[PDB]
């Protein structure tokens, strides 16, 4: 824990699939200096073998202003949020299927191939983030001083 101290508070939403590695991804949701940073990792090898299970694919850096907006959705107030950079065009909105769940669909490029992806958020993974963000915004507004 000497290391998890000095490191980016973060929380990974995990969705491995050794069954069909065509749905294997790992998102690290971290906050680095006023930066809510998303790292969509892809599975390049299986759980059963040795090695580095995950492999980092596209890293979406989110600017401070977004927290309140993302939260405005996680909290049922907005019906969607949009992100945009020369490298991504993603979206987070309430998943109509079940309540309290959300979907993040990011269509990233890479130096022009569009790498897109999609990560679903179950009622718990949503609550997961929901808190992660409230915390940041909490410290960002500097209450921890």
């Amino acid at each position: 824990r000497a290391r998890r101290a000095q490191l980016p508070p973060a929380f990974d939403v995990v969705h491995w699939n050794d069954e069909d590695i065509s749905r294997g991804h790992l998102l690290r949701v971290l906050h680095r200096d006023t930066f809510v940073v998303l790292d969509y990792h892809r599975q390049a090898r299986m759980l059963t073998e040795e090695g580095n299970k995950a492999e980092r694919v596209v890293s979406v850096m989110l600017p401070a202003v977004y927290t309140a907006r993302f939260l405005a959705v996680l909290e049922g107030r907005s019906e969607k949020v949009e992100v945009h950079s020369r490298y991504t065009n993603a979206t987070f909105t309430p998943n109509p299927a079940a309540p309290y769940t959300f979907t993040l669909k990011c269509t990233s490029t890479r130096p022009d191939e569009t790498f897109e992806w999609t990560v679903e958020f179950d009622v718990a993974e949503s609550l997961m983030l929901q808190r992660f963000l409230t915390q940041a915004l909490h410290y960002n507004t500097g209450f921890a001083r």
């Binding site: 000095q6 508070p9 973060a10 939403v13 718990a124 609550l127």
Partner: protein, 147 residues
């Protein structure tokens, strides 16, 4: 160990029915545990012998994503959460009098899956709700990182 935790020490006159359930959490990991009662009730505040049996103890380390699901239940965001791993098969549901965590778990130095069920009621359900809603918020490392 010097972790956030709360224990419920239920000691009976019938050593077979007393237990010490401990709920603590290390970072993103909740550790639910229970040791049985080792023989009779101590009665000498000086007697520093073991009052609960650390060998028939029930230990279960949960995932980070679990700690989340558990709150769900407390918030009615999920009617009942059911996790399954190699060492146990449990469920955590909301009750009109509190919480219910049960399933088949298994003691240290065993492979004999035994039927298990621990409950959190009244003023204990409260206590447990606060511990969980807290584990989660502090489970991200913000407090330590900024300290």
């Amino acid at each position: 160990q010097s972790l956030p935790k709360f224990e419920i020490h239920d000691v009976r006159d019938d050593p077979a029915e007393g237990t010490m359930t401990r709920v603590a959490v290390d970072g993103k990991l909740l550790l639910i545990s229970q040791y049985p009662q080792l023989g009779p009730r101590k009665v000498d505040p000086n007697d520093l012998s073991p009052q609960f049996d650390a060998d028939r103890r029930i230990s279960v380390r949960l995932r980070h994503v679990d700690l989340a699901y558990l709150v769900g239940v407390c918030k009615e965001r999920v009617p009942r959460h059911r996790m399954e791993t190699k060492a146990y098969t449990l469920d955590f549901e909301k009750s009109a009098q509190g919480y219910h965590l049960h399933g088949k778990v298994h003691r240290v130095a065993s492979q004999r899956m035994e039927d298990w069920s621990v409950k959190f009621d009244n003023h204990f359900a409260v206590t447990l709700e606060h511990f969980l809603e807290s584990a989660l918020d502090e489970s991200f490392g913000f407090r330590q990182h900024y300290a």
